[PDB]
Every structure is written in C-alpha cells, then in structure tokens.
C-alpha cells in the first residue's frame, strides 16, 4: 500500500534439477497412469509413453544430425508433438522455436530461417489457416 | 587587437540600432516563440535573470494555467483603475510566476472593448473541474503599488483553494509528473551569471539549513 | 573585486550597472514601448 | 571550486539585516581535457573563496528586502556574536534569521 | 536541494549496460536481411 | 449597413479580400488602425497565405463585407469589394430564376413615391462630403480626402456622420459592452409572451439560428466572455426574430414583415433598451459589485441618434432592389449599398418590406412613441397588436386602401424639405 | 460447438484458455444442456498485462452460464509465463503468486535502483524461479540484466496500484 513492491509466498518448494529428471521420477512412480488425452490423434499416452517416445524422439534428432548448441523451428498446428519436441529438445539442449502458423507467409518464413538460423525446420504440407 | 574590434562592433551595433537592422533575438534560436498578441508583449521583452530572482511566487502544483484579460478601453471612471492593475499584475508577476511553476501557462490578453472590468481565469489540473474567475476589485483607497500584491495574494489563495478542491489527487500528480514544459518561450537574458548552465539553473538549487 | 580577464570585467560591469542604474532594471523601463497598448494600434 | 563546504555571515547593506550564506561543493574543471590556465586561476581564487571572499565582490539576494544587490558585507563570526549578543530579543527577530533565539 | 544519500546509486555500470543495450540493438537492426546479402557478395566475386 | 434584419436563402461565396506582402503589409497596418471596433470580427476569419502573399476568406452573405463596408477609411479596398460584388450580382441575375414582382400597384406606387425624394438626396450626399472632408482627423485617417465621392465610400460616410450625431463616442462600443445577447434573447421572449398570447411558437428553429449566427459577427470567445452586439446589429436580430416568430401566421410577406420593423423600431428607442439595460458583471455573475445596473443615458440618446439618420438613401439604396431592372441601371448610377443578403429576397419581399417600413414609421410617428418612458405598458401594446392585425388584414382584401396609406404616410414619414 | 460436445464427453473436471476464444464458447454453449457441463468446476484464463482487467461481471457470466464453482484469472507479462498475480471470482484481492517479488524502480540503478512511491510509473524488475531474463533476437540468444539481489529487468515500465495491481505501459517518451 505505502510503497510498490509486491511479494508473494516463500513456502512453496522449488523444483531445480532438468526436465528429463522428473520425467523420468514421474514416469517410474506413475507409469501406467495417463498423461494426456487427444481425440482427434488418437493419442491416449501414460507417463510411460511420454518417457519412452521422449527420449527416442531425442535419439531421432541425434541421428538426424541435432547437437546440443543449435536451433529447431516448429510450425505444427496444435499436435501432441510439438510438446513431444519440447521434451526431446529438452533432453538433448537445443533450442526449440515455436512461431505461430495464424499469419504465415514466406517472407516472414525466411525471416525466422534469417533469424534462428535453425538446423531442423519442423513443418507440414497441409495447415489449417483461419 | 582584440579591443578596437570591440570598439567597431560596439559603434556598428548603434548603427543599426539607428537604422533598425539589429535582430535582439539572435541568443534565442533554440527557443519556441511566444504568442504574438495584444496582451502577452510580456513574453517577448528579453527579462533579466536578476529580478527572475528577486520576484519567486509560488502557487499551488495543481494549477495548470493562468489568463489575464483586459479591456483595451474602460468606459467606467473607475474602470481605468481595475485595467491598471491587471496590466500591472499581467507585466509584473505573469512571467515569473511561469517560470518558476513551470506546469503553468500564462497568457495576457489586451481584448478591445469599453468595459471596466477585468478578470483572471484559473484552470487546475482536473479536465472535469470547472475554471475559477476572479474579478479585480480594486479598493478606492487603495494606490497601484498596493492592490497588485492584494491581487497576487488573491491569486496565489485561489490556485491553493482550487488546488484543495480536487478529486482524487493521484490522477492530477501523475498529469502533473507528466505535464511537458510551459516556460520554454521565456527570454531571459543572464546577467554576469552565464558562464556555465549549472548557474543558468541556479534558481533552482535551494540551500536547507537546519534540518 | 579588480577583474584580472576582461570578461571578468564584464560581468563586474553588470552587477554594477545593476546596482548603480536600477532603474534601468523596473519593468516600467522594460515596457518603454508599452505606456500604452502594442504599437500596431496607434496613428500616422 | 570549490572544494570544500563554508559557512559565512553576510550582512545586507542597504538595510542592514544579517543573513547567512553557504558555499557548496563544485567541481574541479577536467584534469583529462587540460587546461593550465583554468586549473590555476581557479586554484589561486579557490584559496581566496576560503579567506573570507577577500578580492570577491558578493552578490547575493536580501530576504528581508527581496532583491539582489551586492552590497553584502562578509563577517568573521567573531564581529557576528559581537553584533549578536548585545541585541534586544526582538530585533533578533527583525534582523536575523528565524529562530536564532 | 541536490543532495544524495552515503549509499548513492550508481551510474558507471547503469551507462555501460544502457549504452551496450544501445549497441545490441544497433546490431539487431542491422541484422535484418543479412543472409540473403551474404549470399550475393559470394556470386559478386565470381563474377568478378 | 442599409438593411438590418432582412435575410434570405443564401449560398457561401469565398472572396480573398486583399493583396499584400508578408515583410512590409500595407494592408494590414491599415485595417488594424481603422478596423478595431469588431477586433474579434477581424481575428476570427481564415488567413489564407500564399508565397509573399496573404488573404483573407470573406463570405459575402455574411455581414462581414458590411463590416468591411463601413469601418474601412482605404478607397480601394472596399471599391475592389463594391465593383466585384456588383459585377457577382449581375452575373447571378442571369443564372438566379426571374424575380417575384407582386403587384404593378405597389410599383406605381414606389414610383411616383421615389420622384420627390432627392432634394434631400442632395442634402444627404454633400453632407457626406462635407463629411469627408473633414473625415481626415486625428481619429481616422484617409489616404486622399479630398478625392471625389463615389458609389463605394457610402457607407463608411454614413458611419462617420452617425458618429457625429452621436453626442458620446463611442455609443456603439459602450452599448455593446453593455448588452449581452442572451438577455436580449430571453427578454425578447419576454415581449413575444406579453404582445402575443400562446403565438410565435417558442424559439428559432436550427436554419434560422445558424443564418443569424452567420448574420452576426460574434466576439472574443475566450474562457469567462459573454457574447456582445453592436446597436445596429442588436436591430437586427430584433426583426429578424419578428418574422420568423409567428407560428399561427399564413403565408404573406407584407403581414409578418411588419412585425419585423416593428421590433427593429422597437430596438431603436431608448427607453426599451435601457430598460433591458444590464452590465456583464450583472449577467455573468462575475462582479456583485457595480454602481449602475442600467446603460447611461447618454450612450442611450446617442445610440438612437445613430440609427435614425439617412432615411433617404436607406429608401433608396433597398428602391433598387424592388426589381432586377431598376436594379440593373441603378447599381452604377444611383446611390445604392450593394449587399449578397437581399438578392434572394428582390421582386416581391424587398418591395413589400419598403412598404411596411413606411406603414410601421406611420405608426411610430403619429403616436410619437420613441419619448415614451414605458414602452411595456399594457395599452400601448394592445393598439400595437391590434395596429399591425389590421394592416395585416388590409392590403389582402383591399390593395388600393394600403397603397394611399403607403403614399400619404410616405410623404408624412420623409419629410419633404 | 464439435469442442462443447467433446469435452462435455470427456470429462473434464477443468480447463484452460484465454478470453478471446471463451467468447466462442459462451456463443454457443447456451445451445446445449446446462446439466451437460455438471462435470467443468473451475475454470481458467490468461491475461498480457496489455488487455488490462478483464472485467468481473464477465467472469459472473461464465460461471453462471457453465454452472461454474470458481472462475481463475491469472495475469502477468509475456516473459513470467502470464503468471505473476491471480484472482479467483469470489476473491477480488490480486494475490500474488508464491516465490515472485515484482518492483518498480527509479532509473539511476541496476542493482541498487530505489523502489518508487506505489503510484509512480518507473521500470519494472521481476524475481522468480518462473520468470526468464534471455530472450532470442535476430543477433542470437540475448540477455538482460540479472543483478546481486536477484531481480531481473524486464526492460519494461509499470505502475503499480495500492492494491497490489499492476499496469504495463510502453517506454517513457518525453
Ligand atoms: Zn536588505
């Protein structure tokens, strides 16, 4: 009220170790349980797929030629897969570029190509625009 | 050889201040003009900075503007008397008063019309609120020399009285906080202090004693 | 004060002549061309 | 200059009304850009501000008659509490400073 | 009137990460397009 | 200057007043030396600039040309004006649709009524150079006194002999000071609810609000200022609110006409406008403080001095503007005011009106009402309703009976020598 | 309308979103059941402090419209994740999210900038666990200043409100 700042409450714990880390502490303690529901994928996954198809999708971007320093560009509409690739890109520290495909056309595109400069360009052949 | 140079500059200045080339506002090329008007030929005089520092008025921070109209001809007999003292109030503390408020604007008008009685119109930081117009009222027994401080303390009480009057402050102080600078126009020519712009300042550092 | 720069010597001329010739200082003597209104509304 | 902070006592000339005055920290014209001749003078003036502006012509603002002349008379303190203790409580009022009891 | 506090802020490290800012941006500016550019210098000089 | 009150449909015409250069302005120092009396009137116009050129954005239907007409000592301006507007007129003759022409009666009448009147044309026209002569003074200054009268400087002459006739200078400004608008609005309601039971509906509609506000040059519109009108402009708006009045009124011109010089004539007398009479202060609420509420005799004698003055050339000069053929020879040769505002209005309404000013003056002088200390009182405006009824209901039945009142009071309203 | 009618089969017990496509919702859920939505308890939306406030009669309409226990609102700049401060619907109070200290501070200072007077606009400068100083440009991965006390610049000027509320506003001008 007198001054501005504005604090809130220190006694939540704070969880510090990497992304893989609790994937893979969450995938051993509940490893049958579902993790997220699609209808329109057909993608019914538990802890155990999203551990598993995670770090295979990180293998994947190995073998395709991904290292730890560079960029990955993603224009995929609202799939189970682009949160796949931010665990993958996860795993294997690169950097992940989500750009939104609602306004999208080719200049702007070799913007973000002049941008980013990204080793992976993640796209699709047919996108639903509004 | 640089005091005869001086001598032929001084004799070639009052030359042309015979023959009317002389431009008296050649410091002045980086300031915004002031409005040419029958009233404010108070802003156009070149004032010195020594009696900027001998007249400091004050008025509250909420007031955004002062107006001082008057007639050109005054009908009345005691008309005459009301439109001397508000040329003498719109001369002597408008400019001042501007320059050290500096969120306030103030503009003289000489308006052409018989009519005896001058007024002031003060305009504070709310859009919502209503200007206050004071009349000059000057007193019979009361001389030129006396009723022009009579009018400045009226004044100086109004913008504090409408200053008090305002709805919630915090909306006025961040106007106020965020007000650009109204006394740009003013000329003033800076007397054996030009040296340096920390004493072109200079009226604004205040020593505190005693705290 | 003995002015050892002569624009030393201008500013003592300054605050002299503001002191010494003060009326030169009044707004009256400011305002010479204004005894009356603004010089546009006068006669030939 | 000036360097060092200094405390004066001034008298108004024209109605002989004491005040005080206080000179505050300047600083020194840049030692990098160098200029003998500005770093002397105001060497030899600075040492002159500290002796009770002795070669400096003081121009000042009266507050009791507001207006800015300099006919200011700088007193040592000593010639101050000579002035100042032999006065009547109610001209210290009109002299000098508030308070100042 | 213009007096700090003992514990006054500073400004040699607020000029140099201000002014830095200033470059970065510069450099953001002038980024803009550099492929492509960087792609005809290499055809300029063979066909020089 | 001729005509106060009379309007018709009009049409904005920009006219650049004059030529002048940015670094030495003639023009300028003249009008600002010569024109003050409506400062505001000259402040509120668009400046049009050009390369070392400026000019001024005049509408012609606007009283302003008027203004022009009357406050201007330069010769060639208003002689630049006057030619120009004439040869417009001329020119709009032949685009503008054939006048109304009423009734042949009325122009025989008109007619045989103009023939005697100059005598006193003379009078009045060597009295304007005498008048010119003497024009150069230490108030007003004129470039070539002596040069010749002609058909553009009549106006301004006619300002300088109202002057004179004015015993205190200046009436116009002092009055004006005096006199808010809206006061003089309210109370004309005020008027219209005594003289008119449940009649002449309740205020102007929005065609004939904003024709008077182009029929006004209005006033420094500064914070804390209560709009002003000049006397003859303060007549104008009393007629001009007389027409447009009446709401139970059929249409004829000659009926709700009369209502119009009545309340013109009606601002002419002292006694209403100093019983109307308040300061700024009063109206405003500004100054509680004030010695005298009402407008000083004087000012008020002089005021009525001013509009009576040149009845001749007032006949005259609107004479021409019964017709377009009488109007085609006696722009150039007879003495006329040539003003955009009664164009519209020639054949039927401008003839109409000359007879209702004659008809009206009958009235004013048989009952010598301009001494009347109270011109409010309840008889008095009774006959006055029942006065204007009558002529109203005469002239529609039977023409010839209001053309011998026309003639006779004619020759009693001007007199003769 | 296909979205309704999947997640009233789905059986979600709370969702997510932003005002702007919670419009669409509110257009076309009064078509259905009311009983249909029984299972949507709470529900939650976003807010760029840019929007500011979305209104609480708003909020009233979505719970009454979906048969709602509790309307979440959560608000914060672009780089907190738009979580710094949250609001419930029977809570008016912005109570702040845990482990976050949001200041607004004068210009003369980095880490030692002073906290302004509660309504002054200043720059803004925020510490939490969830709130990022890098940002990627053009010139390459980029970053802000994270000073010895431990808040972080946002580069972006703000006033704050006496009751906990903050308002975001463009660079300073003049
Ligand atoms: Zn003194």
Redo the contacts with the bound molecule.
């Keep these: 009220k007198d001054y501005s700042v504005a604090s809130g409450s220190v006694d939540t714990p704070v969880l510090d170790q990497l992304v893989g880390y609790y994937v893979n502490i969450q995938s051993r303690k509940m490893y049958y349980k579902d993790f997220l529901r699609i209808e329109h994928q057909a993608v019914r996954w538990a802890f155990a797929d999203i551990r598993k198809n995670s770090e295979a999708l990180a293998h994947g971007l190995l073998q395709t030629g991904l290292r730890p320093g560079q960029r990955v560009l993603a224009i995929q509409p609202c799939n189970c897969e682009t949160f796949v690739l931010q665990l993958a890109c996860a795993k294997i520290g690169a950097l992940l570029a989500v750009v939104p495909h609602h306004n999208i056309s080719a200049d702007k595109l070799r913007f973000y190509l002049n941008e980013f400069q990204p080793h992976h360009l993640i796209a699709r052949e047919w996108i639903v625009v509004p | 050889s640089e005091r005869e140079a001086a001598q032929y500059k001084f004799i070639r200045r009052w030359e042309l201040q015979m023959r009317d080339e002389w431009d008296q506002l050649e410091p002045f090329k980086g300031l915004p003009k002031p409005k040419r008007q029958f009233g404010n030929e108070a802003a156009e005089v070149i004032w010195p900075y020594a009696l900027l520092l001998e007249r400091v008025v004050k008025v509250h921070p909420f007031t955004k503007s002062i107006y001082v109209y008057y007639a050109q001809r005054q009908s009345t007999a005691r008309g005459k008397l009301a439109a001397e003292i508000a040329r003498s109030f719109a001369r002597e503390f408008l400019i001042p008063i501007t320059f050290h408020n500096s969120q306030v604007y103030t503009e003289a008008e000489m308006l052409l019309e018989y009519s005896e009685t001058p007024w002031v119109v003060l305009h504070s930081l709310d859009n919502g609120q209503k200007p206050r117009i004071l009349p000059v009222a000057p007193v019979e027994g009361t001389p030129a020399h006396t009723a022009v401080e009579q009018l400045l303390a009226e004044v100086v009480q109004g913008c504090e009285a409408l200053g008090a009057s305002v709805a919630d402050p915090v909306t006025a102080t961040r106007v106020l906080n965020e007000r650009p600078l109204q006394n740009q126009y003013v000329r003033v020519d800076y007397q054996w202090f030009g040296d340096t712009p920390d004493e072109r300042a200079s009226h604004l550092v205040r020593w505190e004693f005693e705290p | 004060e003995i002015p050892k720069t002569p624009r030393e010597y201008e500013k003592l001329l300054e605050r002299q002549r503001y002191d010494e010739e003060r009326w030169k200082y009044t707004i009256e003597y400011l305002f010479r061309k204004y005894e009356d209104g603004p010089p546009e509304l006068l006669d030939r | 200059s000036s360097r060092f902070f200094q405390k004066y006592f001034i008298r108004?000339?024209?109605?002989?009304?004491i005040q005080r005055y206080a000179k505050g920290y300047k600083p020194i014209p840049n030692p990098i850009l160098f200029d003998s001749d500005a770093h002397c003078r105001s060497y030899h003036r600075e040492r002159r501000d500290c002796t009770g502006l002795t070669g400096t012509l003081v121009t000042c603002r009266?507050?009791?008659?507001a207006?800015v002349?300099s006919?200011w008379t700088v007193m040592d303190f000593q010639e101050f509490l000579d002035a100042k203790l032999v006065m009547t409580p109610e001209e210290r009022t009109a002299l000098l400073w508030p308070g100042a009891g | 009137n213009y007096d700090e506090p003992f514990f006054f802020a500073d400004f040699e490290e607020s000029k140099a990460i201000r002014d830095y800012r200033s470059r970065w941006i510069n450099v953001n500016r002038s980024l803009v397009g550099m492929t492509k550019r960087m792609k005809e210098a290499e055809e300029e000089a063979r066909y020089m | 200057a001729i005509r106060y009150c009379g309007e018709l449909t009009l049409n904005a015409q920009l006219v650049l007043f004059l030529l002048y250069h940015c670094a030495q302005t003639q023009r300028g120092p003249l009008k600002e030396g010569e024109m003050p009396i409506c400062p505001g009137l000259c402040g509120e116009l668009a400046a049009v600039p050009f390369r070392v050129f400026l000019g001024t954005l005049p509408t012609l239907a606007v009283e302003e040309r008027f203004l022009r007409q009357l406050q201007p000592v330069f010769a060639w301006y208003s002689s630049r004006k006057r030619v120009k507007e004439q040869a417009n007129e001329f020119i709009e003759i032949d685009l503008a649709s054939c006048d109304a022409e009423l009734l042949l009666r009325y122009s025989h009448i008109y007619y045989v009524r103009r023939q005697l009147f100059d005598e006193l044309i003379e009078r009045q026209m060597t009295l304007l150079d005498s008048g010119k002569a003497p024009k150069m003074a230490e108030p007003s200054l004129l470039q070539c006194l002596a040069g010749c009268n002609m058909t553009i400087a009549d106006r301004l002459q006619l300002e300088i002999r109202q002057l004179g006739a004015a015993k205190r200078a200046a009436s116009v400004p002092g009055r004006r000071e005096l006199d808010p608008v809206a006061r003089l609005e309210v109370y004309d309601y005020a008027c219209m609810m005594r003289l008119v039971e449940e009649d002449a509906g309740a205020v102007g509609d929005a065609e004939m609000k904003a024709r008077a506000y182009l029929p006004r040059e209005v006033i420094e519109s500064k914070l804390g200022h209560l709009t002003q009108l000049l006397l003859g402009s303060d007549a104008r708006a009393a007629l001009d609110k007389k027409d447009v009045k009446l709401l139970n009124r059929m249409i004829p011109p000659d009926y709700t006409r009369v209502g119009c010089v009545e309340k013109l004539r009606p601002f002419d007398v002292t006694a209403y406008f100093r019983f109307y009479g308040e300061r700024i202060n009063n109206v405003k609420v500004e100054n509680y403080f004030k010695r005298a509420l009402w407008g000083h005799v004087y000012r008020r004698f002089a005021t009525t001095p001013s509009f009576l003055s040149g009845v001749s050339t007032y006949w005259a000069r609107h004479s021409g503007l019964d017709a377009s053929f009488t109007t085609t020879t006696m722009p150039q040769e007879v003495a006329v005011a040539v003003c955009d505002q009664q164009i519209q209005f020639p054949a039927i309404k401008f003839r109409a009106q000359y007879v209702y000013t004659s008809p009206e003056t009958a009235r004013q002088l048989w009952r010598t009402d301009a001494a009347v200390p109270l011109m409010r009182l309840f008889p008095l405006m009774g006959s006055r309703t029942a006065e204007d009824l009558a002529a109203g209901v005469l002239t529609d039945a039977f023409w010839m009976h209001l053309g011998l009142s026309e003639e006779e009071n004619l020759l009693q309203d001007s007199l003769l020598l | 309308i296909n979205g309704i009618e999947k997640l009233c089969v789905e059986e979600v017990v709370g969702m997510l979103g932003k005002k702007s496509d919670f419009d669409l919702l509110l257009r076309h859920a009064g078509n259905f059941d009311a009983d249909q939505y029984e299972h949507l308890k709470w529900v939650v939306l976003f807010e760029d402090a840019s929007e500011p406030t979305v209104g609480d009669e708003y909020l009233q309409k979505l719970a009454k419209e979906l048969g709602l226990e509790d309307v979440f609102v959560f608000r914060g700049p672009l780089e907190s994740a738009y979580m710094v401060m949250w609001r419930s619907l029977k809570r008016a109070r912005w109570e702040m999210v845990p482990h976050v200290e949001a200041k607004v501070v004068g210009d003369r200072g980095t880490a030692d900038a002073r906290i302004l007077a509660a309504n002054t606009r200043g720059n803004l400068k925020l510490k939490g666990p969830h709130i990022s100083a890098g940002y990627y440009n053009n010139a390459g991965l980029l970053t802000e200043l994270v000073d010895e006390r431990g808040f972080c610049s946002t580069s972006r000027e703000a006033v704050m409100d006496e009751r906990g509320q903050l308002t975001l506003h463009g660079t300073q001008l003049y």
Aim: aromatic letters at 0%; charged letters at 25%; glycine letters at 8%.
């Design positions: 108004c000339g024209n109605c002989q009304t009266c507050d009791k008659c207006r002349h006919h």
